[model samples]
Target: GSGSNVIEIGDLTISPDEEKIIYKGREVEVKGKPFEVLTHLARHRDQIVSKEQLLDAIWEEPEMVTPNVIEVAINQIRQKMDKPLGISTVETVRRRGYRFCYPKPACEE
Candidate 1:
């Protein structure tokens, strides 16, 4: 396998540097911090991603922003990405955190 900066999870193609997310060859409308949040969860797919972890990873100064920002970004991501596809992209773990669990891989034929 070749080393590529681009990340592929199921049918979606995510370019971290370009800040673009593509599904079925169509570019999705996700940008800014929401994009960052998507990428973070995508890279660590299936794992529990805590709010503190996201704050530390995404924001330069975590204290400046409230934890509620995470939920807002998540809402945007779900609205723009999941709602259109009729799929659940992110999983909310109540008070714990969020998890990206969509487009699960198909078994080898």
Candidate 2:
């Protein structure tokens, strides 16, 4: 790893120090609200993290941000970062919320 603050989950290495996300061997750029979502998901990898929880985590005041933004950020994460790696960690729990899941070998199972 790249020191303590940098966390490795499956193929992703997230560095808070640099605010960079590395998937596989390449570096992927992440920013703003989406980055917050990513970090929250990473922190609770084994559990199904709800959208409400994410909403509370992302915004200082829940009502300040609309719920639709979460959907948009999720799609962005899938397309921009996850899709290229062919390894999706954020799986939609459908109707309920989202869950962060990694590759099998790197997973808790």
Candidate 3:
């Protein structure tokens, strides 16, 4: 599983299979939904994932989701993933959605 494989963004490493994050080689625990959200954004790389898209992805039923749920998840992700890593991997795009800012190599194998 690609998701199971380690994803390196700056000094942080995310392991989807383990549902844990490694910052500076220190293990950090993360929940399922938040991990999935982070994984999605990481897979998308630099693109902006709209609120609607996030809702749809996070919750199967987008219409049933409460307001600020996405915000809360993002906040959690940032609090857990970014602050300790000393890098801003996820960014909120005003009037839009979130963007994963980790730079990827141009050469795709």
Which candidate ranks first by TM-score, i.e. highest? Answer: 2
Model 2 segments beyond 4 Å from truth? 1-4, 60-62, 104-109
> What is candidate 2's lDDT per residue for 1-109, written digit by digit as tens?
4455667775567776677877656787666557667665685444577787777666643565787767777788777667776667777888668877665455544
Clashes within 3 Å, all models in order: 0, 0, 0
For all predicted structures, in order, the TM-scores are 0.70, 0.71, 0.65
34 Cα displacement, candidate 2 (Å): 0.8
Clashes of 1: 0
RMSD of each: 4.5, 4.0, 5.9
lDDT of each: 0.70, 0.69, 0.66
- Pairs in clash, predicted candidate 2: none
lDDT score of residue 14 within candidate 2: 79
What is the per-residue lDDT of model 1 for residues 43-81, given as tens digits with 9 covering 90 to 100?
Answer: 755456777777666764356678877788778878877
Residue range with the least summed lDDT across 10 consecutive positions in model 1: 99-108
Model 1 residue pairs with clashes: none
Candidate 2 has its poorest 10 consecutive residues by lDDT at: 100-109
> Looking at candidate 2, what is the lDDT of residue 42?
80
